[PDB]
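Note on ligand handling. Small-molecule inputs were canonicalized before submission; formal charges were left as drawn, and no protonation-state enumeration was performed. Where a ligand contained multiple stereocentres, the stereochemistry in the source SMILES was retained. For A1AK1, this procedure yielded the string shown in the input block below.
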Amino acid sequence: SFSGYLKLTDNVYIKNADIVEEAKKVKPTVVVNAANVYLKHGGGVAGALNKATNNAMQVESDDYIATNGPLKVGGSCVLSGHNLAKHCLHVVGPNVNKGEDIQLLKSAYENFNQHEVLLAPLLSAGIFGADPIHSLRVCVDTVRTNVYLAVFDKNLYDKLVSSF
Ligand SMILES: CNC(=O)c1cc2c(N[C@H](c3ccc4c(c3)OCCO4)C(C)C)ncnc2[nH]1
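Structure output:
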């Protein structure tokens, strides 16, 4: 039920959209969160996704962390998608603004391959400091499953498409 996506490759599609609004209309099987190792959903996609669940995502995330400890950079966990999706795949991409190794971005994208279809943001772009053009490149070169990328910024969306 994804509509208005531009085809980039056989399995990668892209749209200028807010991933929260896209998730509510579609209610996909998997929505990807741009998470940190602590699952503290304060800003960016994480804060926007959590706010849409009335904080139910954060309460569930704190219980997960209390039992399992923090995730690894490049790692992921599957939790409830609440009112946005069946599941939320919380993926930790490297935060370049915190000195984390950009090489871990491919490892972060590999988590996508465990799911047939996903609605996702561009990993490590935004407040994480990675180059969004590099992030799209790693995505197309790593994900083999069907991924629908939601890019919030119109001017970034245009730049991404015109340079692909
Ligand atoms: C109220 N809604 C929002 O604040 C919102 C932001 C947002 C988003 N932003 C992108 C991004 C990529 C990757 C991230 C990220 C942000 O946040 C931290 C780390 O990972 C780029 C284009 C800025 N993409 C899709 N839906 C989004 N919704």
